[PDB]
Amino acid sequence: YILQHADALVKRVSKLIVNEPAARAALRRGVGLAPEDPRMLAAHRVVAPYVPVHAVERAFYAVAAIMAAQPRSARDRPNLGVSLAQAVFDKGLNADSTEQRLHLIARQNLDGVHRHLPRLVLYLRSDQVHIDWGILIRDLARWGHTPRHVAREWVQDYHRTLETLTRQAE
Template sequence: MAMTKDDRQPFVAHLERLRDADDRAALAALRRGLGKPPGSALEMHRYVVPWLAEQERPWADAVHYLVASLFALHPQPGGSGSMGTALARVAASTGAESTERRFVGLLNCHGDDLPRHLRQAVSLAKAHDVPIDWHRLFGDLMGWNHHSRYVQRQWARDYWSLSRPVQEAEGEAHDEARAPEGARRVGRAGR
């Protein structure tokens, strides 16, 4: 799905400008927020505060700090889709069940635990060269605490719909390996 101009987040565009200008000092300052409560790394304020609403909004402010620190960890351009899509791509390249366990942990986590779970997810994506759609992530995190959990449900749909072809292929290979020798030849000829 192509991103429209309305989907672009001005704050994320600001982060992308820092990356594109190769402002290593800014990205280093933003990375100092990793593993800390959002907003507690004073070095980040210079780059984040100008983008916050005048009236404090705790969750929105926390999302700004969280996305800034995670972006600085893995600023690779070119991401598309939700975090569920990104982690499905990681799982497809590794085949590791641990990716799915971490993803389920992310879906189930409370907002207070989100920084830790997202840092793990972004680190996995970085390790496997899977870019993140930072505009989408920013928008999704703004809705993380919605009572309907629509963000978590969409991420789950994205993750398991992308991993389904891999699971089906593995299932077919497993079924074929268990079939008697003659049945394997017939099965291949019938395809």
């Protein structure tokens, strides 16, 4: 389900971004802010119609905006943990430090994920790390019902894929 509308947002947006400068600037001004906040209303005009509990809508708005606030250097089924571990092993980011940030997000609430998440994801996309935004969207949607479950999946995926990537370098 949800993933279907999420894919519509990823093509649309990702397609409405690199192909638009005014819309890109109008949606990026609302990263890490509630959909209720006036400052992001300029964004509804692009994303509001696909919002399929309330947590969701917050999810779609979030990702959409954060996905849109990347530098151009980053512009142009795995989870986020596997993307982080592969980014550590490949791009050589700090491992132990991205480690504590993962352990801090895995405890947050629906409102905390969207305020702790932007630094790691936007910085992760910095230095061109691949990130499947659709899975991330459905994940942010999964905080409304199973926060701890999604958190556990993110962390587990990270360590398991880090271990397998280290062992396959035998």
